[PDB]
């Protein structure tokens, strides 16, 4: 679980990078689909599922919006993300191994954009937070 120190480092980081969250979400989602092709089946209903794609761009905005929600609900992730856990883990039955993949790609994308701010200290807390997200999303499976 996160410490008040972890919470503060996530808020301060998000404070620094959240301006570019639209580009972060597009980029992180593009990379998950290219580097981890097994994930493309969840978006097979879109006409264009390649990095340029208008659909990836619109949906990455939405995913970074869910992260922004987890940041503001950082003290109770389980309740804050219950609607989203319902959607993924109940309806779409997204296989949870895939949440670690998207989380990895978000870290790569932040590293790519904010190398100076993405220090190892910021990385431990962002990594605990992102695993808290994955865990909150996995709540409704069973």
């Amino acid at each position: 679980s996160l410490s008040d120190k972890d919470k503060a480092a996530v808020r301060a980081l998000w404070s620094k990078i959240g301006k570019s969250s639209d580009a972060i979400g597009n980029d992180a989602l593009s990379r998950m689909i290219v580097v981890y092709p097994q994930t493309k089946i969840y978006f097979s209903h879109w006409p264009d599922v390649t990095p340029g794609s208008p659909n990836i761009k619109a949906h990455g905005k939405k995913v970074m919006g869910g992260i922004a929600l987890a940041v503001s609900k950082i003290d109770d992730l389980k309740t804050g993300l219950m609607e989203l856990s319902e959607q993924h883990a109940y309806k779409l039955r997204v296989d949870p191994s895939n949440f670690k993949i998207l989380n990895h790609c978000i870290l790569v994308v932040i590293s790519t954009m904010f190398p100076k701010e993405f220090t190892p200290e910021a990385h431990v807390s962002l990594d605990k937070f992102l695993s808290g997200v994955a865990l909150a999303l996995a709540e409704r499976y069973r």
Binding site: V34, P51, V108, P120
Partner: protein, 146 residues
């Protein structure tokens, strides 16, 4: 692994422009900090205190460079990754008893440090080739015992 000629060129460009003295120490440092149970496997390393101990510990640096040089050998022999790693696979998964899941953690830290160095040049397709490479290396490191 079946490699494409585009993959061969990407992987070769990457390695050819990498500073091992910069990447290796930062990748290993970061791995020891983000996943601190990995510090356990490193017997005799010294004062591994806090986060700025680890970051400027010359022994961790020294060792970060040996890891990148160990990758350098699979890059030079891509059609035979599996067998160039029997020595290392045997030390890591039978003399050191390192859980396979950890090669995956370090490999994720090398990617993150390499993405911060290359910036925008570290594209999805670049990432896709490097990841295929490292999954082959990780596969070859555990390969020894089941």
């Amino acid at each position: 692994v079946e490699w494409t000629d585009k993959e061969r060129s990407i992987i070769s460009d990457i390695f050819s422009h990498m500073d091992y003295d910069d990447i290796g120490p930062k990748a290993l440092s970061r791995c020891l900090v983000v996943y601190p149970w990995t510090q356990r496997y490193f017997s005799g390393f010294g004062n591994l205190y806090n986060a700025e101990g680890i970051m400027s510990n010359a022994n961790v640096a020294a060792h970060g460079i040996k890891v990148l040089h160990g990758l350098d050998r699979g890059m030079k022999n891509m059609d035979n990754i599996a067998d160039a790693y029997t020595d290392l696979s045997t030390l890591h998964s039978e003399k050191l008893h390192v859980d396979p899941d950890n090669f995956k953690l370090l490999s994720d830290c090398i990617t993150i440090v390499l993405a911060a160095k290359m910036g925008h040049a570290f594209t999805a397709e670049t990432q896709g080739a490097f990841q295929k490479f490292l999954a082959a290396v990780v596969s070859a490191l555990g390969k020894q015992y089941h």
